Structure 1
């Protein structure tokens, strides 16, 4: 793990973004843990979060024109990361733009996406549903998606039906031929924060991963 990933994880517990318990996910799956990025809610935490995203993006060498955040929670993410890229990235990141959608229209707020290289930013990927929806919106605007970044790759399958059992992030990359970046993955949480996870929570996570974990 890199230092910024360690700090991200440390702050994730501090602000309670990483919670263990019983959670019904968007996809319907009953999960033993939940990552709530919305809990990085202070000026200090948002600054650190924007920095983590920016570092991951810069180190990827991805070339793009526009960072797009899906409504609603992706909107602040796109804005703060756009800023942070200009602050820590140097000359080629000064003119990167940000955009987002309205839920109902004139759907896109920002410069026209047509023929621009777009990086999608979001919080967490589980089954990949949220990113597919963002893809649809971008394609309607005639944007060219060149990559995606999330804070947490939960490293789960799109569906248990799929025999290959590729993760949601793996399936997006393969389908589109685009990088899918993550600040951290579930494996990083398990290994680094092993002490702060109890024996029961450890087993609950492993049992969950037996059903939903990528191969």
Structure 2
């Protein structure tokens, strides 16, 4: 009803491959969470194919205009790559010539074409690092025009500031750009209706209440 078909498909695969788990989980903060998410578990050719398609459709539907998809080392490298491919495969003539690029985290160089006057989309797995990418890109004269992750957790950044912004909202405000996501926690909650009873369904909604950011 609210959920697109690519979002429903992503979430069912997410649950099947165990990238999305439900139960009792303690976050790094110590806060207790009704689910756990690891995109890494999208780890086969089939799963990666579907993951790439799900990112690709979110990007096409967003209407965002860009020249280069950029994935921060290390998790963003394979993601940038498979999604660049997918865009060209299902996106039509406009997405044929989209370049991809990423960075060596040397102990900084960019692997790809010159970013000067190029509009850049950042792709990564999650958003929790962000400034690093913007720095690298702006140094190369690249203009970041957007960001996409798989799951927007929609959690307020500060505990004792319930009316504060989420991670994605914070980034979107600072750089003036959209931060897309395949799904958000509200989407998880929506998909779970009729798959669970008002038991765990409640738990998660009551977690969105306590820790979730407003639209």
Superposition TM-score tier, normalisation by shorter sequence: 0.7 to 0.9
Mind listing any 5+ residue stretches in structure 2 that lack a counterpart?
none
Rounded to whole Å, the distance in 1 between the matches of 2:38 and 2:100 is 23
Structure 1 residue 34: deviation in Å? Answer: 1.6
Cα gap change, 1:22 to 1:134, in 2 (>3 Å): farther
1:62-101 CA distance string (max 9 Å, x none): 1101101111111110000000011111222111111111
Give the 3 Å change call, closer, same or farther, for CA 107–197 of structure 1 in structure 2: farther
Q: Is the 1:120–1:149 contact (alpha carbons within 8 Å) kept by the matching residues of 2?
A: yes
| Deviation per residue, 1:108-166 (Å, 9 max, x gap) | 221232332110111223xxx34344323323333211011111111112223446322
Deviates more, 1:156-165 or 1:140-149: 156-165
Mapped contact 1:138–1:144 kept (Cα < 8 A): yes
Question: Paired residue for 2:170?
Answer: 171
Q: How many matched pairs?
A: 212
Give, in whole Å, the separation in 1 of the partners of 2:211 and 2:66: 32
1:158-193 CA-partner distances (Å, limit 9, x unpaired) = 223446322222222222221111111111111112
What is the alpha-carbon root mean square deviation over aligned residues?
A: 2.2
CA displacement, residues 10-34 of structure 1 (integer Å, 9 cap, x when unaligned):
1111111101234444566443312
Change in 2 beyond 3 A, CA 1:29/1:145: farther
Q: What secondary structure is seen at the aligned counterpart in 2 of 1:98?
A: strand
| More divergent stretch after superposition (48-57 vs 26-35) | 26-35
Q: Which runs of 5+ in 1 are unaligned?
A: none
Alignment CA distance shift 1:166-1:51 (3 Å) = same
> Secondary structure of 1:199's match?
coil
The answer to which of 105-114 and 184-193 deviates more is: 105-114
**Paired residues of 2:156 and 2:162 also in contact (CA < 8 A):** no
Distance 1:63 1:201, change over 3 A: same
1:43-82 equivalent positions in 2, closer than 5 A: 43-82=45-84
**Residues of 2 paired with 1:17 and 1:109: CA distance?**
29
User: Could you list the per-position Cα deviations for residues 43-68 of structure 1 after superposition, in whole angstroms to 9, with x for gaps in the alignment?
Assistant: 11111111111111111111101101
- Counterpart of 2:194 in structure 1 is 195
Cα 1:205–1:79 shift into 2, 3 Å: same
CA distance in 1, matches of 2:92, 2:110: 27
Instruction: Give 1:203 shift.
Output: 4.6
Question: Does the CA-based 8 Å contact 1:102-1:109 persist in structure 2?
Answer: yes
| CA separation of 1:24 and 1:163: change in aligned 2, threshold 3 A | closer
Structure 2 length as normaliser, TM-score? Answer: 0.87
CA distance in 1, matches of 2:58, 2:169: 18
